[PDB]
């Protein structure tokens, strides 16, 4: 499947040692199927495969 | 979490206060006062009648 239309917003952080961050990402898809996430800089990791 | 006020001495009016603590809701309580007493400390000198 592709996705065409995305925004990022960001309602909180606290730079801890443990995961101490959210973000909510919109999107339009053409069918139902599974995608993967990943990030394009190095200070910053995310847990979700 | 510690939170401090000043409160004038009337009775009879209520007062509000703001709570704020990142990452979660704001929160507001309200107060208000009914009595306050003061007391000496006493002794006998002698009586009459």
């Known amino acids: 499947p592709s996705v ?5 917003e960001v309602p909180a952080c606290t730079h801890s040692s443990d995961f101490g961050g959210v973000a909510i990402i919109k999107y339009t898809a ?3 199927g599974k995608c993967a996430v990943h990030s394009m800089t190095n200070a910053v990791t995310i847990r979700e495969a | 979490y510690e939170h ?3 409160i004038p001495n009337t009775v ?3 007062y509000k206060t703001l709570v704020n603590r990142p990452g979660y809701s704001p929160m507001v309580l309200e107060m208000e006062l009914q009595s306050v007493t003061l ?3 006493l ?3 002698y009586i009459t009648c």
Request: proline share 10%; aromatic share 0%.
């Open chain 1, 4 to 8: 065409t239309d995305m925004s990022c």
């Open chain 1, 30 to 32: 053409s069918k139902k």
């Open chain 2, 4 to 6: 401090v006020t000043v």
């Open chain 2, 12 to 14: 009879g009016v209520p």
């Open chain 2, 39 to 41: 007391e000496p400390t």
């Open chain 2, 43 to 45: 002794s006998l000198d």
